[PDB]
mmCIF file of C-alpha atoms in Angstrom:
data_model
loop_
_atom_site.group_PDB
_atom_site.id
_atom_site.type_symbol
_atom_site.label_atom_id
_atom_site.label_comp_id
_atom_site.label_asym_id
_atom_site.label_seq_id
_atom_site.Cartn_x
_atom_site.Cartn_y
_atom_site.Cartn_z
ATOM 1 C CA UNK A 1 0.000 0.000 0.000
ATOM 2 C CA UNK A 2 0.974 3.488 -0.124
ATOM 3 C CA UNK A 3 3.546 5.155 3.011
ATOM 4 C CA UNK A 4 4.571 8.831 3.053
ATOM 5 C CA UNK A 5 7.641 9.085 5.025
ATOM 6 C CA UNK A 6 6.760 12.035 7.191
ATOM 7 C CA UNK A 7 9.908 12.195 9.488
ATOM 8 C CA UNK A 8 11.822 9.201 11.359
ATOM 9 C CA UNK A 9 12.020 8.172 14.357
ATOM 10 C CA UNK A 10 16.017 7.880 15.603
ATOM 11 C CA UNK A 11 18.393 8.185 18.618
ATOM 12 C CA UNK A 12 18.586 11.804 19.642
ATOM 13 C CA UNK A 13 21.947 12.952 18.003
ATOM 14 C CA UNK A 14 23.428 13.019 21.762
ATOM 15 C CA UNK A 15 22.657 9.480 22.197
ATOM 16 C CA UNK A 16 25.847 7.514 21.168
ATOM 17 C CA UNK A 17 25.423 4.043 23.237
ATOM 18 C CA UNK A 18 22.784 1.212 23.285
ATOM 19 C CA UNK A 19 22.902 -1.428 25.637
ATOM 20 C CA UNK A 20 22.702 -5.319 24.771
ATOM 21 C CA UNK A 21 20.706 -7.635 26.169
ATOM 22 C CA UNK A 22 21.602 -11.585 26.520
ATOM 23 C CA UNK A 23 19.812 -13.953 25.234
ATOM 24 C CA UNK A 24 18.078 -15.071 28.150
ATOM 25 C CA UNK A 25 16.278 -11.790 27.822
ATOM 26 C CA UNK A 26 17.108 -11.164 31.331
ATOM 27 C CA UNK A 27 20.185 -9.269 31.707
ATOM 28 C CA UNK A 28 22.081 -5.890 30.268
ATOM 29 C CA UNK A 29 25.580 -5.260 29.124
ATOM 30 C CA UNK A 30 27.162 -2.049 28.839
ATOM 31 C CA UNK A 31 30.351 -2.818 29.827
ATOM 32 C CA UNK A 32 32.630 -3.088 26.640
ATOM 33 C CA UNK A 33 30.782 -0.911 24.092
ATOM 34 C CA UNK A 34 32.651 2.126 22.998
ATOM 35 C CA UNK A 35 31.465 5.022 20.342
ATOM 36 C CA UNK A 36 33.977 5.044 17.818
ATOM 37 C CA UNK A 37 32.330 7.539 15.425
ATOM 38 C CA UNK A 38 29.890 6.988 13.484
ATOM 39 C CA UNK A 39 29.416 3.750 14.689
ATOM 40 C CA UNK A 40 28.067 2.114 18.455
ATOM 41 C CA UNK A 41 30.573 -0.704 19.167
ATOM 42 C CA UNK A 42 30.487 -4.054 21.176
ATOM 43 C CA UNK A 43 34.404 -5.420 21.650
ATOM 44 C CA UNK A 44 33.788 -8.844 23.090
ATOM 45 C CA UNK A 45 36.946 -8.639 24.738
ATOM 46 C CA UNK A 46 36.039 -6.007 26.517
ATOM 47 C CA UNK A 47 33.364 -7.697 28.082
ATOM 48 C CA UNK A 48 34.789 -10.797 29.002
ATOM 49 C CA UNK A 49 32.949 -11.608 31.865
ATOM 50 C CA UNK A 50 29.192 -11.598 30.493
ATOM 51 C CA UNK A 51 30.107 -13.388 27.202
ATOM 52 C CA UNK A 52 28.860 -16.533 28.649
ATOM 53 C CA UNK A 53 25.588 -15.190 27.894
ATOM 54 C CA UNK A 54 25.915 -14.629 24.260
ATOM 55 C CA UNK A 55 24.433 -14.082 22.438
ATOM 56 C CA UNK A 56 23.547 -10.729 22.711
ATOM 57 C CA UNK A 57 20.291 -8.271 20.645
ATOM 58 C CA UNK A 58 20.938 -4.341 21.111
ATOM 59 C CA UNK A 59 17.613 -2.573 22.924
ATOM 60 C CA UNK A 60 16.239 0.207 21.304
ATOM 61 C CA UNK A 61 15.455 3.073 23.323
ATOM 62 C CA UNK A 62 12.842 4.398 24.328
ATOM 63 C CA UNK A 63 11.334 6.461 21.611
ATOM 64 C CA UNK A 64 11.078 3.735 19.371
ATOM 65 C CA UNK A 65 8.232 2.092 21.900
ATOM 66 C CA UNK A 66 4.575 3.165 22.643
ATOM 67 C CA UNK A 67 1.983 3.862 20.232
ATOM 68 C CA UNK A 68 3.407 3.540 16.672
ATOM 69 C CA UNK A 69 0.364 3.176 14.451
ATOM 70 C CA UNK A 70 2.213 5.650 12.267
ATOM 71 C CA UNK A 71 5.142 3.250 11.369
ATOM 72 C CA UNK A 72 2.971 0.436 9.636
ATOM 73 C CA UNK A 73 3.395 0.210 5.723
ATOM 74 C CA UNK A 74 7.206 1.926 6.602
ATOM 75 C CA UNK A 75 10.978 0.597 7.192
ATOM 76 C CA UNK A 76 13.099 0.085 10.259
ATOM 77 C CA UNK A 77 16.412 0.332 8.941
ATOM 78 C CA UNK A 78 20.083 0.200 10.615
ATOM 79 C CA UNK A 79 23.567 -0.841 9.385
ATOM 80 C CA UNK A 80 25.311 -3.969 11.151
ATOM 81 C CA UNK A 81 29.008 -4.364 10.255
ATOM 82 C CA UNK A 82 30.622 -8.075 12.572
ATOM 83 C CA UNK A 83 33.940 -9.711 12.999
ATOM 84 C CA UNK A 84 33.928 -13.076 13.846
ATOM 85 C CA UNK A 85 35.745 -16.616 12.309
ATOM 86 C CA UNK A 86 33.244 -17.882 10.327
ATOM 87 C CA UNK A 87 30.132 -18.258 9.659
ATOM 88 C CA UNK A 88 27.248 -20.192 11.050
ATOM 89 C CA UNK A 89 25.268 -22.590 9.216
ATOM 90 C CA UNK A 90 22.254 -21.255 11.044
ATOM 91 C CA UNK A 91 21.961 -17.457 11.298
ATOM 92 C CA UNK A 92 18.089 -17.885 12.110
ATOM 93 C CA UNK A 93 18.126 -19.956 15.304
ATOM 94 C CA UNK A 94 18.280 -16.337 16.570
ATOM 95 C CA UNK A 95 15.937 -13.823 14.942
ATOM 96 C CA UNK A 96 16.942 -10.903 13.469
ATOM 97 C CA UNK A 97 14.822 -8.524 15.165
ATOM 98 C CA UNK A 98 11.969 -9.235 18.102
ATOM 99 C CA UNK A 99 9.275 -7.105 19.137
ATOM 100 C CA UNK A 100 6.982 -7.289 21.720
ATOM 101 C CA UNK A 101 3.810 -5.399 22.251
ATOM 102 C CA UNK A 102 0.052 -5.396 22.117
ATOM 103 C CA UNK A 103 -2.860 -4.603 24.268
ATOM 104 C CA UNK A 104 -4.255 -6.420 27.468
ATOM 105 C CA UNK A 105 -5.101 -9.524 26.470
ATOM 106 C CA UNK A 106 -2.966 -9.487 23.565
ATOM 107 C CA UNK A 107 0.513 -8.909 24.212
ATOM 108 C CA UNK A 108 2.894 -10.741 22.281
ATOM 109 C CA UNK A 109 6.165 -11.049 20.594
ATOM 110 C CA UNK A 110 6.923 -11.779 16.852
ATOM 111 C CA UNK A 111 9.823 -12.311 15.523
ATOM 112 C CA UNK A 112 11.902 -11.115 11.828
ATOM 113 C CA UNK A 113 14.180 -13.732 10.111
ATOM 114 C CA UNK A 114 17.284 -12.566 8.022
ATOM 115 C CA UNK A 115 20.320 -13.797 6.709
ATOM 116 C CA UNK A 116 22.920 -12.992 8.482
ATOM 117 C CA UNK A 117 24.882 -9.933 6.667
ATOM 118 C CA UNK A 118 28.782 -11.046 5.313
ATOM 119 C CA UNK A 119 31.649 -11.057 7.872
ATOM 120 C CA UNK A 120 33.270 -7.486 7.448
ATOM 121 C CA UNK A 121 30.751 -5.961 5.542
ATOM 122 C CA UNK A 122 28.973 -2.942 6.556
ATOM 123 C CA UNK A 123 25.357 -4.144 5.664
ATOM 124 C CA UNK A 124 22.170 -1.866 5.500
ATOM 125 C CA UNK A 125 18.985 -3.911 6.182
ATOM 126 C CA UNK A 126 15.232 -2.820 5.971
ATOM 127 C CA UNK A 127 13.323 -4.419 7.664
ATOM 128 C CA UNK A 128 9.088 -3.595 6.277
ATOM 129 C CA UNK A 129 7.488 -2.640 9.281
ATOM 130 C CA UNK A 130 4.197 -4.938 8.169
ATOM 131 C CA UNK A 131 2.704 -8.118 9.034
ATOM 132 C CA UNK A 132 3.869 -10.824 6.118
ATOM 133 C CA UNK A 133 7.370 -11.992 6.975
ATOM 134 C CA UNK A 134 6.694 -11.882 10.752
ATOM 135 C CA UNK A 135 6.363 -14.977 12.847
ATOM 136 C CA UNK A 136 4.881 -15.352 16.359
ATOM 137 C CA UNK A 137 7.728 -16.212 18.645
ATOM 138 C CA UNK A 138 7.034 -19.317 20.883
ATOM 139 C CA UNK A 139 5.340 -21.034 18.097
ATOM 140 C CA UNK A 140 5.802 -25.034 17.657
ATOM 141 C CA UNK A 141 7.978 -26.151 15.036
ATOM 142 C CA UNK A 142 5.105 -28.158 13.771
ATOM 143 C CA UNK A 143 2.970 -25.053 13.171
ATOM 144 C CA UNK A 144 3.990 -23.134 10.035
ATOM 145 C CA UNK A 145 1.799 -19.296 10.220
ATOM 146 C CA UNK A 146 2.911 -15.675 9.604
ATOM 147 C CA UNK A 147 1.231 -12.980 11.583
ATOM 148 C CA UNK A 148 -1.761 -11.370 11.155
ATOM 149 C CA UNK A 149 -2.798 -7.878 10.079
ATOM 150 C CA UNK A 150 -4.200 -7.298 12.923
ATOM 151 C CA UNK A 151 -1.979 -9.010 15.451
ATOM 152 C CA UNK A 152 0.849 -6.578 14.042
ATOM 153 C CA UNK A 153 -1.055 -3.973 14.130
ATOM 154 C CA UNK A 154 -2.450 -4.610 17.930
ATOM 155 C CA UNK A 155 1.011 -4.652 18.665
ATOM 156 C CA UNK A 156 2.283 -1.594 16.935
ATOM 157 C CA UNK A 157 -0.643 0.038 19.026
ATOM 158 C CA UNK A 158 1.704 -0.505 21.665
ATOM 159 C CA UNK A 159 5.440 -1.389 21.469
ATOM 160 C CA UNK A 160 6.613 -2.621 24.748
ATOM 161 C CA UNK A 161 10.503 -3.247 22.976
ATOM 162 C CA UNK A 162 12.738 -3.778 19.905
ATOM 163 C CA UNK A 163 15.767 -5.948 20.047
ATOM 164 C CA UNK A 164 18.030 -6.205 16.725
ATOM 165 C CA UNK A 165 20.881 -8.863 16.623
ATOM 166 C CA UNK A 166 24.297 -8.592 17.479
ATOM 167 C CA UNK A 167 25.927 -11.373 17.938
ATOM 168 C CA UNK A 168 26.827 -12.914 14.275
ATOM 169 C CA UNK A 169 28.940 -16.004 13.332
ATOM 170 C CA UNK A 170 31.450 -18.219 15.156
ATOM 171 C CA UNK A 171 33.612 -16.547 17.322
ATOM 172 C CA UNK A 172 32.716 -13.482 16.774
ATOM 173 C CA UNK A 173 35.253 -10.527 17.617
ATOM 174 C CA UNK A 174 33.007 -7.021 17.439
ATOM 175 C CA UNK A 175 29.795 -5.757 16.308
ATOM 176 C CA UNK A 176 28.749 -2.423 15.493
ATOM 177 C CA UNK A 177 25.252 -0.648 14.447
ATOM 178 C CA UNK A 178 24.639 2.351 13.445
ATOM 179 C CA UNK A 179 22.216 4.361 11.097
ATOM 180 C CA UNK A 180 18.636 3.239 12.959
ATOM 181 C CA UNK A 181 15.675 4.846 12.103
ATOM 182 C CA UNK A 182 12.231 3.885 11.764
ATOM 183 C CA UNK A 183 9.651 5.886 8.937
ATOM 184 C CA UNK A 184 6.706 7.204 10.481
ATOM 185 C CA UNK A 185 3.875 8.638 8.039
ATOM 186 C CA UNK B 1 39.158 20.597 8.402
ATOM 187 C CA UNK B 2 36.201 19.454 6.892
ATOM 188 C CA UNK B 3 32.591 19.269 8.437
ATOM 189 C CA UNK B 4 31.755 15.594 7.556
ATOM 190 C CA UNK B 5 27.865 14.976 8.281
ATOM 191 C CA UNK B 6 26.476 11.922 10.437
ATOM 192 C CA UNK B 7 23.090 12.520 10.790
ATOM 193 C CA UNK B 8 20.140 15.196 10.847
ATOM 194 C CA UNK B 9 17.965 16.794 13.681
ATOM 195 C CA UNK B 10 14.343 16.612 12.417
ATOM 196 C CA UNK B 11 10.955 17.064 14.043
ATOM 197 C CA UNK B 12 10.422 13.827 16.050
ATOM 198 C CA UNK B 13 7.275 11.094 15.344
ATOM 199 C CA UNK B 14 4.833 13.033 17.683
ATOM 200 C CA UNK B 15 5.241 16.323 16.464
ATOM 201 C CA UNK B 16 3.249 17.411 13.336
ATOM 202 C CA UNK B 17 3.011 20.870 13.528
ATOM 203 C CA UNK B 18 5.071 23.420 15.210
ATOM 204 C CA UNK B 19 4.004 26.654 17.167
ATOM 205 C CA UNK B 20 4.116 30.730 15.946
ATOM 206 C CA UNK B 21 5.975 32.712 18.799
ATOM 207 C CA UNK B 22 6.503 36.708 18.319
ATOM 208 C CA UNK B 23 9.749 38.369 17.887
ATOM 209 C CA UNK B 24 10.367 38.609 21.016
ATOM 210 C CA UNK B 25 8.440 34.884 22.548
ATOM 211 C CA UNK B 26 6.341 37.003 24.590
ATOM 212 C CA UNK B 27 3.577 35.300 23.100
ATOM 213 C CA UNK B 28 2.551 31.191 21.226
ATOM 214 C CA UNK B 29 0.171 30.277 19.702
ATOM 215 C CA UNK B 30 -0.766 27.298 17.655
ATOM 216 C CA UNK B 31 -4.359 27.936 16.916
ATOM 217 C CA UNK B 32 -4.669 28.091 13.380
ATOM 218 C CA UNK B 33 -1.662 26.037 12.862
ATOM 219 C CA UNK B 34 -2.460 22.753 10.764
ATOM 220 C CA UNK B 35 -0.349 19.790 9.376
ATOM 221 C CA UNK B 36 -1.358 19.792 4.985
ATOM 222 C CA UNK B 37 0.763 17.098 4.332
ATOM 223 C CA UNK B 38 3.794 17.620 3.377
ATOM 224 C CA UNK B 39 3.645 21.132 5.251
ATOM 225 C CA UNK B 40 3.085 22.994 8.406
ATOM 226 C CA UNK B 41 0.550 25.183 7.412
ATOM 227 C CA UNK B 42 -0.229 28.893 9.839
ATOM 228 C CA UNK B 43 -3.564 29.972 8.685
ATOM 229 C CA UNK B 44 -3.442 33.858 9.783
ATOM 230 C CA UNK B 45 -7.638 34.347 9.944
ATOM 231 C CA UNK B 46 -7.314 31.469 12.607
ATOM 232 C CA UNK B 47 -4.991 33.835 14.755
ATOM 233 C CA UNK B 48 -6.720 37.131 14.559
ATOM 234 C CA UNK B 49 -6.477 38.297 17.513
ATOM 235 C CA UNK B 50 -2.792 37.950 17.541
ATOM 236 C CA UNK B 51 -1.625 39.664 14.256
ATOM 237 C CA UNK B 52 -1.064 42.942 15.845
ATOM 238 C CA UNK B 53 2.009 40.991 17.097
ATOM 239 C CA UNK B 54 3.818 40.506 13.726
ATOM 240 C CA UNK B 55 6.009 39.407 12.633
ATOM 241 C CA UNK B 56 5.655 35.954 13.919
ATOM 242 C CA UNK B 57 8.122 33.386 13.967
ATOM 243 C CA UNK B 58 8.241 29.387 14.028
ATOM 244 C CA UNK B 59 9.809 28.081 17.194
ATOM 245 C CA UNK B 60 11.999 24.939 16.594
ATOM 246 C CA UNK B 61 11.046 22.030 19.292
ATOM 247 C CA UNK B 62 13.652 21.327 22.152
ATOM 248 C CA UNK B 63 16.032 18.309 19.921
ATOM 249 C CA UNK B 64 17.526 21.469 17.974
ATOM 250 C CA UNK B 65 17.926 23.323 21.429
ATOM 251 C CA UNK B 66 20.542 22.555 23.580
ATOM 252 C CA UNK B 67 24.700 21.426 22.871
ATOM 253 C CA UNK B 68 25.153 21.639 19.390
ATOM 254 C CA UNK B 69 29.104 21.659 19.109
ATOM 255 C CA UNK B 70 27.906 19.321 16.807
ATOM 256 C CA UNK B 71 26.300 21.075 14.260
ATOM 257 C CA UNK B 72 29.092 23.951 14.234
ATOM 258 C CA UNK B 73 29.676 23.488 10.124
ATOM 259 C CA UNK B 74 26.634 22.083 8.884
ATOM 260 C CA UNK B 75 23.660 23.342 7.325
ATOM 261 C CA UNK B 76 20.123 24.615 9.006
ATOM 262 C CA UNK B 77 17.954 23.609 6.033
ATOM 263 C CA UNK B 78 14.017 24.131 5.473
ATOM 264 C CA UNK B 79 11.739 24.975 2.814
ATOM 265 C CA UNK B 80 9.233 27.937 3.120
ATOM 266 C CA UNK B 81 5.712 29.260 1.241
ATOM 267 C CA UNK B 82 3.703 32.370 1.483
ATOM 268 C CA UNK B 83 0.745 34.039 0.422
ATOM 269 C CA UNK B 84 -0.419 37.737 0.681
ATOM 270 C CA UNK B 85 -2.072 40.825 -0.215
ATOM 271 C CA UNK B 86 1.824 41.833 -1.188
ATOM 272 C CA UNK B 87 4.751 40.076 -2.110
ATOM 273 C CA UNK B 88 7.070 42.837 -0.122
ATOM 274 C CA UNK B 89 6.199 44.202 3.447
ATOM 275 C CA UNK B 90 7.429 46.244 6.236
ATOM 276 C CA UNK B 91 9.059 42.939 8.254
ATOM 277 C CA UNK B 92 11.164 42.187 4.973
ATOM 278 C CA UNK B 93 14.497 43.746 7.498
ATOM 279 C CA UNK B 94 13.346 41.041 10.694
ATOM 280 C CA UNK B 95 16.034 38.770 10.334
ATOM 281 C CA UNK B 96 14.777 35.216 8.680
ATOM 282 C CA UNK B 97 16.723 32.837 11.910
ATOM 283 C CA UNK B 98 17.553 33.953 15.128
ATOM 284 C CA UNK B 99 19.078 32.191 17.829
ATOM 285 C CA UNK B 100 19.902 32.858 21.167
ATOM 286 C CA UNK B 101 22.246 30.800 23.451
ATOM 287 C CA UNK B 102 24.996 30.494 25.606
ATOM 288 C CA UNK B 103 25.474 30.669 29.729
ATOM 289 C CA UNK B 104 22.437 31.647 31.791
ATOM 290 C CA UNK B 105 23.595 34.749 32.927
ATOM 291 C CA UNK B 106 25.524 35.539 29.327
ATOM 292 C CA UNK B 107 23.293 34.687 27.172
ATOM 293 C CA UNK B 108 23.508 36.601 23.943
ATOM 294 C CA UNK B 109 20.989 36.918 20.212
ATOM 295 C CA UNK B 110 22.320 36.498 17.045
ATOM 296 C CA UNK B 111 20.887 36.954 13.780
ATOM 297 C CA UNK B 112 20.771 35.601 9.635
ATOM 298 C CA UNK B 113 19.180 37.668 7.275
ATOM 299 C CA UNK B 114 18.200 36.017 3.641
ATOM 300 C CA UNK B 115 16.927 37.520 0.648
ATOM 301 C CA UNK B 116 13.384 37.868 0.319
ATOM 302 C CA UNK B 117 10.929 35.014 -0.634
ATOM 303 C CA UNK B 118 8.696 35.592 -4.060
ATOM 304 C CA UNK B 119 5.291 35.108 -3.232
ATOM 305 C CA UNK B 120 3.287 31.821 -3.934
ATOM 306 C CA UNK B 121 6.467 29.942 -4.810
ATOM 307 C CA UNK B 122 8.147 26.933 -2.811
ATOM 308 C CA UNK B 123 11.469 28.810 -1.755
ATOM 309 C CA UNK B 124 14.142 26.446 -0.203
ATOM 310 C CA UNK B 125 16.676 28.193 2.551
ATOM 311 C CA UNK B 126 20.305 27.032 3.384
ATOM 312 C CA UNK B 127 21.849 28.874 6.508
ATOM 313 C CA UNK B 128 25.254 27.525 7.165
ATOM 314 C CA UNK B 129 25.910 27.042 10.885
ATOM 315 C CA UNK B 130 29.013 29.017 11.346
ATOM 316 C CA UNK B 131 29.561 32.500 12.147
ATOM 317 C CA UNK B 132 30.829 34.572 9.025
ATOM 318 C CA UNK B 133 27.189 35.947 7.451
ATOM 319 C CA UNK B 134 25.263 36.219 11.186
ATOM 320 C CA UNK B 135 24.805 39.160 13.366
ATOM 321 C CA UNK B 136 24.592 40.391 16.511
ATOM 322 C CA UNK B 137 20.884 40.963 17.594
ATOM 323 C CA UNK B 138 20.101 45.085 17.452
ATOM 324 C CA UNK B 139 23.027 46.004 16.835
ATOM 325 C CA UNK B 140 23.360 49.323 16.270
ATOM 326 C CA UNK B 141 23.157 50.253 12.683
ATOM 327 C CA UNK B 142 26.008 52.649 12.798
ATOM 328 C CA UNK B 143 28.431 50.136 12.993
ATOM 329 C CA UNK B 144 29.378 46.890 11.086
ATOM 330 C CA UNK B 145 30.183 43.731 12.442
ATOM 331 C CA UNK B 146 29.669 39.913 11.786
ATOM 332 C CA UNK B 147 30.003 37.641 15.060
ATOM 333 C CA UNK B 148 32.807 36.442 16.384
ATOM 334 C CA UNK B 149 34.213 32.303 16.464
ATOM 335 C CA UNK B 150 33.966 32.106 19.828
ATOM 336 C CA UNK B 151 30.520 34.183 20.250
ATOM 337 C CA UNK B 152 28.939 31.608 17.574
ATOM 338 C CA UNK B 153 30.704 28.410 19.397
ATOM 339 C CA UNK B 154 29.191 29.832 23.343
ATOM 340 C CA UNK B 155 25.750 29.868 21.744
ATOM 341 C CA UNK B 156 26.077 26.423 20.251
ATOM 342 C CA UNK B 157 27.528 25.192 23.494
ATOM 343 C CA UNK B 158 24.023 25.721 24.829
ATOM 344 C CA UNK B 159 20.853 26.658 22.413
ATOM 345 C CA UNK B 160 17.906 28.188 24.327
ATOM 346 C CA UNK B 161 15.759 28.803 20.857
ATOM 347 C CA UNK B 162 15.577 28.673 17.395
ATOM 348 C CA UNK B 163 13.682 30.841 15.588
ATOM 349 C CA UNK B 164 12.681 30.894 11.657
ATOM 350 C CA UNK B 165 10.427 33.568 10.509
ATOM 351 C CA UNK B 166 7.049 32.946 9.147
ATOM 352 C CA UNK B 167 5.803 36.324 8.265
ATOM 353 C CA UNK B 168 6.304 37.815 4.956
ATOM 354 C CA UNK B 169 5.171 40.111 2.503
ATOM 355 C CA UNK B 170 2.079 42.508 3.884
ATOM 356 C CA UNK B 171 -1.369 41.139 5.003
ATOM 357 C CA UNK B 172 -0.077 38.095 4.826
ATOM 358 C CA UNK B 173 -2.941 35.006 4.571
ATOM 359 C CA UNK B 174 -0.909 31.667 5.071
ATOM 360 C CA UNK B 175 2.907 30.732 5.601
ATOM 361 C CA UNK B 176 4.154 27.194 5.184
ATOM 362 C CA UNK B 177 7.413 25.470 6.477
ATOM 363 C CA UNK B 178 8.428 21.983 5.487
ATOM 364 C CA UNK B 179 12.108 20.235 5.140
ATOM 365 C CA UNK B 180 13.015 21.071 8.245
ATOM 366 C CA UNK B 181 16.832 19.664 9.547
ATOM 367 C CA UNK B 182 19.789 20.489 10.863
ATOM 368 C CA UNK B 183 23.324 18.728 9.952
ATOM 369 C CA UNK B 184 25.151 17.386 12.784
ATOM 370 C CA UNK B 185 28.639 15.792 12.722
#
């Protein structure tokens, strides 16, 4: 359908750290990422001590939650650039992004598949902020669905958090993001 | 050195419109005021009781306020449209962005004057954020100075307003702003 990009919805230009989250969903790091300009930066080594809980999804902030009606039909886009050994044969055991949200009663969180972007290469992804290539998280593996209209849009009614991957391949070294923004019409 | 752009300030998701402040911000209003998609939209016959007060200016929200070291070398960009009884009026000499900044207790206004808008035409505005073409506020026209580096560099240190003028021509009847950002590094 049709989207006019009205304005975007971003970091404020002050904000030059995110924190990461494990993947128990339970537990933040901020320990280890620097700002090396233009880019937010996660040096494993420097966080020795909570890379047993790898892996690890940046948290948006704030801004990016709540109502967000106006975001449907638009993109969520940031830039991912990894260092790790190799690659994994499986770069969808983790999702790409997960969101949570909804209305009581209905609060839920789907999840966004992607391949993995090439070690060393600074990778823009956009990510269509509407229902088709979302899947419920939690679902069985015998049950094969995609999410509904309206279950997206009950929970862009009310975002409760976005997550984007950064943890990528074997071993990995460092991950940065940078360039986030979501369209709002 | 070079300026080398990172991002843009732009009006955030929630805010569609932005308010009409006098010269001076001893008075706002935003009755009248009216999102026409793409534009911000001041519809003066909405306001009458506030005209005597012209000219009026649009007051940028609180993200381009603030420490913007940051922007020092980049561009203050929007894109402006007028209508009126007469393309030319007695407020063509108000200076077209004012900002005033710095330390609480030295605080200082200065000023960028542009040619004048042609009536009924989309008229797109570049004000470079350094110091060489702005002004001190009422200066005295006697003498003939531009403001200094480190004037320009205390007010960035810390904005208090922005202000882009929305009155043109004589008996004006609508004003428009639209484009609105602000380079930052």
């Amino acid at each position: 359908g049709a989207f006019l990009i009205r304005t975007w919805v971003t970091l404020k230009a002050e904000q030059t750290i995110l924190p990461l989250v494990d993947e128990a969903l339970q537990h933040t790091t901020t320990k280890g990422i620097v700002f090396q300009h233009p880019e937010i930066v996660a040096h494993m080594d420097l966080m020795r001590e909570d890379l047993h809980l790898e892996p690890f999804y940046w948290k948006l902030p704030e801004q990016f939650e709540g109502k967000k009606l106006m975001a449907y039909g638009g993109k969520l886009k940031y830039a991912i650039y990894f260092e790790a050994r190799e690659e994994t044969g499986f770069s969808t055991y983790n999702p790409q992004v997960i969101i949570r949200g909804g209305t009581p009663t209905h609060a839920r969180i789907i999840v966004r598949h992607m391949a993995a972007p090439l070690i060393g290469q600074l990778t823009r992804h956009e990510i269509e902020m509407t229902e088709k290539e979302w899947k419920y998280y939690g679902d069985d593996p015998r049950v094969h669905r995609t999410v509904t209209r309206e279950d997206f849009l009950d929970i862009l009614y009310d975002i409760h958090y976005i997550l984007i991957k950064a943890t990528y391949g074997n071993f990995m070294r460092q991950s940065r993001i940078s360039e986030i923004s979501m369209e709002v019409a």
